[PDB]
RNA sequence: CGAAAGGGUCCUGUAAGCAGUAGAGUAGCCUUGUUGUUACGAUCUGCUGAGGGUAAGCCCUCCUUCGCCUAGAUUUC
């Protein structure tokens, strides 16, 4: 069940990308900038309960724990284990490379 | 349709031909912008009635590239050789 | 040079003739296109369609007409007395493996 | 100007083709067409979409380990312009393209080696199961060839093989139904 | 120069080299069998309308002697040696 | 000129079928486990950028086939 499926693909309804989520998992600084672009008082649960893999805020720790048992979270985990598509892999697909000397 | 910086030996006709026209095998005029007619239509080209007043009439044009990809879709290749080189060997190539 | 009584096998490309037709009219329109095709090919305004050919046209309902169909058109002599036309065409469906990739071919009388 | 490549599918991206997505972390994504752009907006994986160079490289259907693929790179250290160097670069470019085409054909044939053996085995199994559907002579044809053999003193098997060859040469298709005679 | 030397070495080693009538015959026979299967399936599709109606039983339909003789002749049976005329009712 | 067909150009996204020491696990037979084995089993991999469609207002084809043709009727200082 997706809320308002007609306008899911609009730019104003865009969700966070998987490579950005991978960078959030690798480096806490990048996650810190992403959380700086938000306001904690408007966040669900005052921004205390956050799943990095789903890039999602939850209203309580019980809600976050219950979300971890669902298949969307496991689908995100499987996608992250397979790896996110990046510009470097796009380069390697066509056999291009960067020459820095 | 070749330029001094694009050294591909190719003609003005796009890949698959001009849509609903065919191929341009004669001399052609390339006009900036758009013209009142449609495809296949007779065009009358006239000399300007007055001496021009703009610098655009005085500019000399240097073309770097002319598109010859297919206009029957989202064409990404300027020549059939380029399409074959990007695609690789197909099943019918070994079948032949 | 061509005799009156003659049978040829054709491939009719019904897709380009039914392109854009209203869905409840596609199969009757295809029947009329087969009649018009046979009349153009044989010169006979009297065209008779085999019921198996009608079943083949209506095989997938009113809007599921095949893209290509292989037919045999047989120009024959109208032997009935007081006929308006001396010749007529009879159109049958042909059992082939694949209607694609076939040329027009004259069917042997024997 | 230069030829770019599509981020999603890897096709050449000539000027004024496709669309570029500017992301707020500083990354640009060039797409060659609306198909690639819309699949990106739906967050499909190019590695899983089988029509992409990403999938083909992940599946091993593209030649990747080859010496002819080392000559093209994004040159971040520029070279002072030299007419002889540019002309010899053009000649080397043509030669590299020819050698790459030959090696790609060899790679594809190495991929498609075993097809003949698999198809021959399938053909043998099908024939062994359906020998009764093979072309044969009619009973009346066999009768008339037998009485021709008796009349002419010839080999009945010889006229049978000749008629089988003629029947294989002459191909005829069956037509459904038949006309009903009018009163 | 290194690429050209590699090309010469591969051409000497036979990297670009390129390579049965019984196999051709059995492939042609299998193709004929597949064509016969397609024709049989087309016949079944023509005669079947099981979504909208049931097929009339074969015992309720009189079979023409000419069609039976033609089918047996195509199968390769001497119909004159068995005498199909005396069997057929009128 | 028409109808097919072939080639090109586009659109989709990898056909049917077969096979596989891929497949969570379950049940049998015995060497009672040593891919033990056989059977089933979403899916995965290979054959396969394959299959399908392509002018209906896409392009090319004296040199790929089959057919058509110097009419008929009406009228005119
Ligand atoms: Zn989660
Ligand atoms: Zn693309």
DSSP secondary structure, A15-58, as one string: PPPHHHHHHHHH-HHHHHHHHHTS-GGGSGGGG-EEETTTTEEE
The single-letter DSSP state of residue A90 is H
Which of residues 67-96 of B have CB within 7 Å of strand F?
69-70, 72-77, 80, 83, 86-92
Tell me the CA distances in angstroms from C77 to C4, C6, C74, C87, C109, one per residue in order. Answer: 8, 10, 10, 5, 14
Cα distance between residue C105 and residue C94, in whole Å? 12
Element (H, E) at C75: strand C68-77
Sign of CA dihedral D111, D117, D118, D123: positive
Provide the chain D residues 22-41 that lie in CB contact (below 8 A) with chain A: 23, 25, 27, 38, 41
For the beta carbon of residue E79, count every other beta carbon within 10 angstroms: 20
Cα distance between residue A89 and residue D74, in whole Å? 15
Tell me the CA distances in angstroms from E51 to A21, C24, C65, one per residue in order. Answer: 53, 20, 18
Give nearest nucleotide to C104 (CA–C1'). F66
Query: How far in angstroms lies nucleotide F50's C1' from the CA of residue B90?
Result: 10
Q: Which SS3 state, helix, strand or coil, does residue A11 take?
A: helix
Which candidate, B87, E1, E11, places its Cα nearest to that of D67? E1
Quickly list DSSP for chain D: ---EE-TTT--EE-TT-SEEEE-TTS-EEEESSHHHHHHHHTT--TTTSTTSHHHHHHHT-S--S-GGGGS--EE-S-----HHHHHHHHHHHHHHHHHHHHHHHHHHHHHTTTHHHHHHHHHHHHHHH-GGGS----HHHHHHHHHHHHHHT--HHHHHHHHHHHHHHS---EESS-PPPP-
Burial of A35 (0-12, 13-18, 19+ CB in 10 A): middle
What letters, b where the CB count within 10 A reaches 16 and e where it falls short, cover D137-172? bbbebbbebeeebeeeeeeeeebbeebeeeeeeeee
Both structure tokens of D52: 């992409």
Cα distance between residue C47 and residue C32, in whole Å? 10
The residue to which tokens 């698959």 are assigned: B16
Sign of CA dihedral D46, D50, D55, D56: negative
Contacts with C76 (C-beta within 8 Å, 6 or more apart), sequence order: C5, C87, C88, C89, C90
- Would you say C90 and C44 are in contact if contact means Cβ atoms under 8 Å apart? no
- Would you say C18 and C29 are in contact if contact means Cβ atoms under 8 Å apart? yes
Cα distance between residue E32 and residue E25, in whole Å? 11
Cα distance between residue A98 and residue E81, in whole Å? 85
The residue to which tokens 């005029």 are assigned: B29
SS (H, E, C) chain E: CHHHHHHHHHHHHCCCCCCCHHHHHHHHHHHHHHHHHHHHHHHHHHHCCCCCCCCCCHHHCCCCHHHHHHHHHHHCCCHHHHCHHHHCCC
Cα distance between residue D78 and residue D76, in whole Å? 6
Provide the positions of strand F that have an atom within 7 A of a protein CB.
Answer: 2-14, 18, 45-60, 64-68
Q: How near does any CA of chain D get to the CA of B37, in Å?
A: 24
Cα distance between residue C92 and residue C95, in whole Å? 10
Q: Which SS3 state, helix, strand or coil, does residue C46 take?
A: coil
Contacts with D76 (C-beta within 8 Å, 6 or more apart), sequence order: A98, A99, A100, A101
Cα distance between residue B22 and residue C65, in whole Å? 32
Both structure tokens of A47: 């921004």
| Residue C23 CA, distance from chain mean position | 21
Q: What is the resolution of this structure in A?
A: 2.2
């Amino acid at each position: 069940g997706v809320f308002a499926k007609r306008t899911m693909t609009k730019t104003r309804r865009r969700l966070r990308d998987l490579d950005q989520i991978e960078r959030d998992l690798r480096s806490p600084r990048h996650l810190q900038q992403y959380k700086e672009t938000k306001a904690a008082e408007d966040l669900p649960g005052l921004g205390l309960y956050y799943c990095i893999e789903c890039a999602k805020w939850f209203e309580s720790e019980t809600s976050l724990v219950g979300h971890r048992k669902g298949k969307p979270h496991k689908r995100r985990l499987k996608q992250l284990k397979e790896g996110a598509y990046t510009h470097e892999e796009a380069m390697a697909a066509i056999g291009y490379r960067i020459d820095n000397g | 349709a070749s330029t001094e910086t694009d050294l591909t030996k190719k003609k003005i006709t796009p890949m698959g031909g001009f849509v609903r026209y065919g191929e341009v095998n004669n001399d052609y005029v390339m006009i900036k912008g758009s013209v009142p007619g449609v495809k296949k239509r007779i065009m009358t080209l006239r000399k300007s009635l007055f001496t021009h007043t703009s610098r655009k009439a005085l500019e000399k044009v240097e073309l770097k590239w002319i598109d010859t990809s297919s206009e029957f879709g989202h064409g990404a290749f300027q020549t059939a050789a380029e399409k074959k080189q990007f695609m690789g060997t197909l099943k019918k190539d070994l079948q032949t | 040079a061509i005799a009156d009584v003659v049978a040829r096998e054709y491939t009719i490309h019904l897709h380009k003739r039914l392109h854009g037709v209203t869905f409840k009219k596609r199969a009757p329109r295809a029947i009329k296109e087969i009649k018009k095709f046979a009349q153009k090919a044989m010169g006979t305004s009297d065209v008779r369609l085999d019921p198996q050919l009608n079943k083949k046209v209506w095989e997938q309902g009113i809007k599921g007409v095949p893209f290509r169909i292989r037919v045999r058109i047989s120009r024959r002599r109208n032997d009935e007395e007081g006929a308006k036309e001396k010749l007529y065409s009879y159109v049958q469906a042909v059992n082939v493996k694949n209607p694609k990739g076939l040329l027009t071919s004259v069917v042997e009388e024997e | 100007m230069r030829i770019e490549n599509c981020f999603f599918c890897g096709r050449p991206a000539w000027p004024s083709k496709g669309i570029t997505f500017m992301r707020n972390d500083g990354k640009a994504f060039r797409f060659c067409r609306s198909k690639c752009h819309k699949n990106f907006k739906m967050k499909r994986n190019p590695r899983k979409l089988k029509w992409t160079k990403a999938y083909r490289k992940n599946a091993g259907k593209e030649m990747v380990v080859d010496s002819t693929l080392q000559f093209a790179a994004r040159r971040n250290v520029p070279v002072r312009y030299n007419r002889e160097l540019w002309q010899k670069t053009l000649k080397a470019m043509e030669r590299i393209s020819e050698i790459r085409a030959r090696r790609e054909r060899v790679f594809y044939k190495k991929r498609m080696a075993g097809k003949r053996a698999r198809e021959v085995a399938a053909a043998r199994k099908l024939v062994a199961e359906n020998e009764h559907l093979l072309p044969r002579l009619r009973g009346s044809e066999k009768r008339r060839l037998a009485e021709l053999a008796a009349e002419r003193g010839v080999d009945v098997e010889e006229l049978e093989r000749e008629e089988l060859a003629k029947l294989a040469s002459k191909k005829k298709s069956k037509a459904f139904g038949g006309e009903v005679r009018r009163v | 120069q290194a690429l050209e030397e590699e090309e010469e070495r591969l051409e000497k080693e036979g990297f670009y080299d390129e390579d049965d009538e019984e196999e051709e015959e059995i492939l042609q026979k299998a193709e004929y069998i597949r064509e016969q299967h397609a024709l049989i399936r087309n016949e079944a599709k023509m005669r079947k309308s099981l979504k909208n109606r049931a097929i009339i039983p074969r015992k309720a339909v009189k079979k023409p002697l000419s069609q039976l003789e033609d089918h047996l002749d195509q199968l390769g049976v001497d119909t004159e040696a068995i005498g199909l005329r005396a069997r057929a009712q009128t």
